[PDB]
Design a protein around this ligand. Structure first.
Ligand SMILES: [C-]#[N+][C@@H]1[C@H](c2c[nH]c3ccccc23)[C@@H](C(=C)C)CC[C@@]1(C)C=C
Ligand SMILES: O=C(O)CCC(=O)C(=O)O
Ligand SMILES: [Cl-]
Ligand SMILES: [Zn+2]
Length: 275
């Protein structure tokens, strides 16, 4: 249904227009990049988190208790479902980048590594958007999926229609919004990204959003594909256009991903990435 590449991170230099090709030319829909981060780094970082020895990352952990099991616990305020003012977002964002830099210990640094991937696939500058008064957006959040939890079906271009995105809209292109994530830890089973042939309908509170995509999606039958990247593999895809979810986690070992999103600037002069 959907066309996904599977390449090694050593090869990224050879796909200088991958991001153009996914968003603009629509010539394929996504991409697994193996070994963007070493497995060592991924274990170190996961152990920093589970031991609570994490640069204080735990203090910006949203347990999302009131959602039950169709959502991740998330470290960092994700831009989604935030008030339009963004005071908490921007505060959380400064903390995240600190704790994250600390956990990666430059071996390699998260932001440096990811930016060089996005650079290699665009030939463009890559930046974390800055806010209207010079605040920083978070480059990423960390998603924790315990046993029996999943991420409910959703589509990413919807996010840029929420009040939270007002400011960011003023920076970005019309065009689609990619999703990216790297697993830190993968579960024994489940926790797969399932992507659907079904596209964001531009004709058309994250509680009522999830109940109203569940009935929208179950109206259509459409074709699916599933991906289960390993620790340190990046999955990068047109999650803006295509409905997708993450399947229930099976077994004790939980699923931890670090990820966000990715889009062209106003004039396609550069890439922005955030969560
Ligand atoms: C899981 N997850 C998030 C989104 C999400 C669901 N409840 C939330 C509460 C606060 C902040 C973000 C969320 C999710 C949905 C909107 C259904 C999409 C994926 C993810 C990881 C996005 C950042
Ligand atoms: O697995 C994750 O970290 C989130 C997957 C997803 O739905 C996304 O990145 O948009
Ligand atoms: Cl998404
Ligand atoms: Zn998504």
């Amino acid at each position: 249904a959907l066309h996904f590449l599977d390449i090694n991170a050593t090869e990224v230099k050879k796909y200088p227009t991958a991001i153009q090709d996914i968003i603009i030319n629509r010539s394929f829909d996504g991409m697994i990049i193996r070994g963007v981060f070493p497995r060592d780094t991924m274990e170190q970082v996961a152990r920093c988190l589970e031991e609570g020895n994490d640069g204080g990352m735990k203090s910006i952990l949203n347990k999302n208790e009131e959602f039950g099991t169709k959502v991740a616990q998330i470290y960092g305020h994700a831009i989604v479902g935030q008030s339009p003012d963004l005071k908490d977002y921007f505060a959380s964002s400064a903390i995240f980048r600190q704790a994250c830099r600390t956990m990666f210990q430059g071996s390699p640094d998260f932001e440096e590594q990811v930016e060089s991937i996005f650079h290699s696939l665009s030939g463009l500058p890559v930046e974390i958007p800055t806010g209207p008064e010079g605040q920083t957006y978070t480059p990423a959040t960390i998603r924790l999926l315990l046993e029996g939890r999943e991420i409910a079906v959703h589509v990413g271009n919807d996010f840029l229609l929420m009040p939270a995105a007002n400011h960011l809209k003023t920076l970005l292109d019309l065009s689609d919004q990619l999703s990216y994530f790297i697993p830190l830890t993968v579960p024994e089973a489940g926790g797969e990204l399932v992507v659907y042939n079904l596209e964001w309908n531009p004709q058309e509170d994250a509680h009522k959003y999830i109940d109203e995509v569940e009935s929208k999606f179950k109206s259509n039958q459409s074709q699916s594909v599933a991906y289960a990247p390993g620790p340190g593999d990046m999955l990068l895809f047109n999650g803006g256009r295509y409905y997708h979810r993450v399947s229930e986690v099976i077994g004790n070992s939980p699923r931890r991903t670090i990820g966000g999103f990715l889009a062209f600037s106003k004039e396609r002069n550069k890439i922005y990435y955030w969560s």
